[PDB]
Amino acid sequence: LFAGTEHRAIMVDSMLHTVYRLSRGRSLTKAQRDVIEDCLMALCRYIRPSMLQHLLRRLVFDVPILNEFAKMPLKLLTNHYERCWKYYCLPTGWANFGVTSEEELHLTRKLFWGIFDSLAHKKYDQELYRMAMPCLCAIAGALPPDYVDASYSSKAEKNFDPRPVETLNVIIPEKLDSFINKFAEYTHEKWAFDKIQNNWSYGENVDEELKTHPMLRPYKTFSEKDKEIYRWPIKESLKAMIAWEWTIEKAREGEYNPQPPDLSGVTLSRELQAMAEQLAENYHNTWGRKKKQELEAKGGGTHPLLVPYDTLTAKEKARDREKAQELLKFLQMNGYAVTRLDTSSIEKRFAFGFLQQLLRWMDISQEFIAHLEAVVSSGRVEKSPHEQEIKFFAKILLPLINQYFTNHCLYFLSTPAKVLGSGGHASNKEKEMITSLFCKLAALVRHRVSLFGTDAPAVVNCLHILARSLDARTVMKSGPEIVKAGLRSFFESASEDIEKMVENLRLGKVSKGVGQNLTYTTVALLPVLTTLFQHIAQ
Amino acid sequence: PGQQGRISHTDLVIGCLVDLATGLMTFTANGKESNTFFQVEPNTKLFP
């Protein structure tokens, strides 16, 4: 019955929050906790994807810790994304549920990356790897490969505690203080302008029901204290701003309504918008700081809304961003320039970073395998300290590779001339990176199938999928000599292995290297080479 | 003009008058005559 709760989405969200909190509850038995978990899952199934956005934000907070309570949410999110994947992935989306607000997409990216990094750093736990065995694969399938987040920057930040740096030991410019004084005077003037737009004329008479604030008097009559009290938020905010390694400099060295409307029309660069976002986030962190200082007296029931300003919904941005924009414009025309990478949309794509991490892990695979054979030859080390890295690789990355590239094969093969997929076509860089990953994995598995053991079937299946995904024409025509040489090396290595194998069948060799070559060929190479040839012919 | 304070609690009432004999059409804003006027030939059919 909860399916159509569009008119009461607020109560639905409150209910979801309460059930989530109760699940995260001390003094609850296992059966009780299971009941809460089942109820939450069932409600999530029938509830619309849009409504769950707030709970997804809260879960983006919690889950990356990968604590004991992180088990059930991994399942909740797996089922939710598997079911509602077209809502996020496809531009049209499901009918009657709509499409993502792009904030859910940003949250989904963050969830994927936080879980990925946390699980990589964690030591192997079979249960946890199994809970993430339904894996980030659902999240990745939901995410479009071409999704570009408006803000792609290191957060560099961590339940939640913001810790300001206090420069009060240094001096403050009295010229600055006077500048914010005149800015607050002019802001009073714009406040009067706003009341005039509201059509309510501030009045000498006092009256609560008009909401006309009697306070409005000649500026000279005011009491000296209220001036600096009302100032102190502005002073504190600007103070924090110059404190957080952001310089204010003079652009051009020294030596009766408001006629000009302060309009938003002015153009702003992506990085300047990022700096306004960071400044608004710092203003909101000093906000949340004084909030938390007030609230710590009661000590319990922390306000859920208190979260990073960029992470929370873009609606709240408008006000603080507008004040930051008007301020920066004001200080720019005056000349007090405020000064704190150019990443292309292609780099900002989710698939680009995912492939980057995969290639980095491939390099790590090369290095610790090399160390492994080096120790095997002499000075054997039984410990195997890369144990966690090997487990992450085998248990997580290969299934993720298989699922992601099986789902999104067309996006990589698509070209602007011919678009096999419903939406989007992969960039040449993404094509090169997938080709490089395939060649690297082939080299890695080469003559090491015994080393991989039970994971070798997974490796070969991933190789098949990658081969089907490759668009070799684009890479060979316009691609780096590195990638072209890697692919050529794959081909020549396959040829050499086959000639050595046919010789071993000639039996000139006595009958170890021969067994290694034969098993590697049969199990991995010849099937993968066959698949690649079939894909090329098709 | 309400570029300032655009929202108006008041409800607008536009009145349309037609003289069938003279073929003349006129308008009123809130009981205030508007400048716009039209003249039509006989036998014309007009729908509100």
Curated annotation (Swiss-Prot), chain B:
Post-translational modification, as annotated: The N-terminus is blocked. Channel activity is modulated by phosphorylation.
Gene name of the record: RYR1
Note: Binding of [3H]ryanodine indicates that the heterozygous channel is activated by Ca(2+) concentrations 4-fold lower than normal. Single-cell analysis of cotransfected cells shows a significantly increased resting cytoplasmic Ca(2+) level and a significantly reduced luminal Ca(2+) level.
Localization in the cell: Sarcoplasmic reticulum membrane
Domain-level remarks: The calcium release channel activity resides in the C-terminal region while the remaining part of the protein constitutes the 'foot' structure spanning the junctional gap between the sarcoplasmic reticulum (SR) and the T-tubule. Pore opening is mediated via the cytoplasmic calcium-binding domains that mediate a small rotation of the channel-forming transmembrane regions that then leads to channel opening.
Portion of the full-length sequence here: 1503 to 1550 of 5037
Protein family membership: Belongs to the ryanodine receptor (TC 1.A.3.1) family. RYR1 subfamily.
Function comment: Cytosolic calcium-activated calcium channel that mediates the release of Ca(2+) from the sarcoplasmic reticulum into the cytosol and thereby plays a key role in triggering muscle contraction following depolarization of T-tubules. Repeated very high-level exercise increases the open probability of the channel and leads to Ca(2+) leaking into the cytoplasm. Can also mediate the release of Ca(2+) from intracellular stores in neurons, and may thereby promote prolonged Ca(2+) signaling in the brain. Required for normal embryonic development of muscle fibers and skeletal muscle.
Subunit description: Homotetramer. Can also form heterotetramers with RYR2. Identified in a complex composed of RYR1, PDE4D, PKA, FKBP1A and protein phosphatase 1 (PP1). Repeated very high-level exercise decreases interaction with PDE4D and protein phosphatase 1 (PP1). Interacts with CALM; CALM with bound calcium inhibits the RYR1 channel activity. Interacts with S100A1. Interacts with FKBP1A; this stabilizes the closed conformation of the channel. Interacts with CACNA1S; interaction with CACNA1S is important for activation of the RYR1 channel. Interacts with CACNB1.
Tree of life domain: Eukaryota
UniProt-recorded name of the protein: Ryanodine receptor 1
